[PDB]
Design goal:
It is classed as viral protein. The protein is mainly α and 28 residues long. The protein is built from one helix and no strands.
Length: 28
């Protein structure tokens, strides 16, 4: 559940934290 979605709201902000921070390792 919401936790899991929360999870994934942690996370998938955490995702948004993959994508944005690698971007950065791409251009570099």
């Amino acid at each position: 559940g919401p936790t899991a979605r929360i999870f994934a709201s942690i996370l998938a902000p955490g995702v948004a934290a993959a994508q944005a921070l690698r971007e950065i390792e791409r251009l570099a």
